[PDB]
Amino acid sequence: ATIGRISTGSKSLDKLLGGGIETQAITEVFGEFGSGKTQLAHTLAVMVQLPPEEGGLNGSVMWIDTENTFRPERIREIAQNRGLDPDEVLKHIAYARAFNSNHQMLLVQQAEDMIKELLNTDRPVKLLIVDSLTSHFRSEYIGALAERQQKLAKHLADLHRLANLYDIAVFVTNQVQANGGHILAHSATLRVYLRKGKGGKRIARLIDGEAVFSITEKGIED
Numbered sequence: 001a002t003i004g005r006i007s008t009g010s011k012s013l014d015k016l017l018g019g020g021i022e023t024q025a026i027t028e029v030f031g032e033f034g035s036g037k038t039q040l041a042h043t044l045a046v047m048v049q050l051p052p053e054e055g056g057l058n059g060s061v062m063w064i065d066t067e068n069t070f071r072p073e074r075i076r077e078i079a080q081n082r083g084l085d086p087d088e089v090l091k092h093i094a095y096a097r098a099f100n101s102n103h104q105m106l107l108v109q110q111a112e113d114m115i116k117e118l119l120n121t122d123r124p125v126k127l128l129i130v131d132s133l134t135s136h137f138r139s140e141y142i143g144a145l146a147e148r149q150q151k152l153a154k155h156l157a158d159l160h161r162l163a164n165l166y167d168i169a170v171f172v173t174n175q176v177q178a179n180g181g182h183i184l185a186h187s188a189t190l191r192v193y194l195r196k197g198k199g200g201k202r203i204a205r206l207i208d209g210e211a212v213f214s215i216t217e218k219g220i221e222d
């Protein structure tokens, strides 16, 4: 398949990304608590449902939530301010809460079943969100870094296989602050560092110019 792109909602961020986040790729956004990673996830879950003329892929979404941070009311707001019907937008987001890192890994295998079911339809899965990808692994493997890296590596390999096999954009978040970070090392297709700037602006930079945007009723925008 050709590489599809999903607009982030921000022209600035889209330019930095070459048009938007790519299908057949894992995009990892990392930064401190409160930097806006989950807001970007919510925005992408709406944008992907637009037609290509508006920066979407007419796509369905699957969302694995590890921190109980998914907010349907926020999806509704973004959808209503992106000219979409909020009920339709929510009906095309499949949502699951991961109880722990092992359940998170099983949910990726489960996601493949729904991906296959929708593959030949007019609303194939085009976006798989894992927010947060690392939080359970970090808490469960304190003092056991080598084992943590083994499990994360298999999890990321599973996500890669889905991205490439089914032409999906995988978008993952990773909280990194004071003294923290192996990030996801070199595993993601693309690493985006997100931070707060003056006056509530958010700033994004590719790791391996900078885009600037705001969090608004449209999700994010210039």
Ligand SMILES: Oc1cc2ccccc2cc1O
Residues within 6 Å of the ligand: 062, 063, 064, 094, 095, 096, 107, 108, 110, 111, 114
């Ligand atoms: O109904 C489902 C929703 C999911 C969401 C994320 C990952 C896997 C899922 C599997 C489901 O059957």
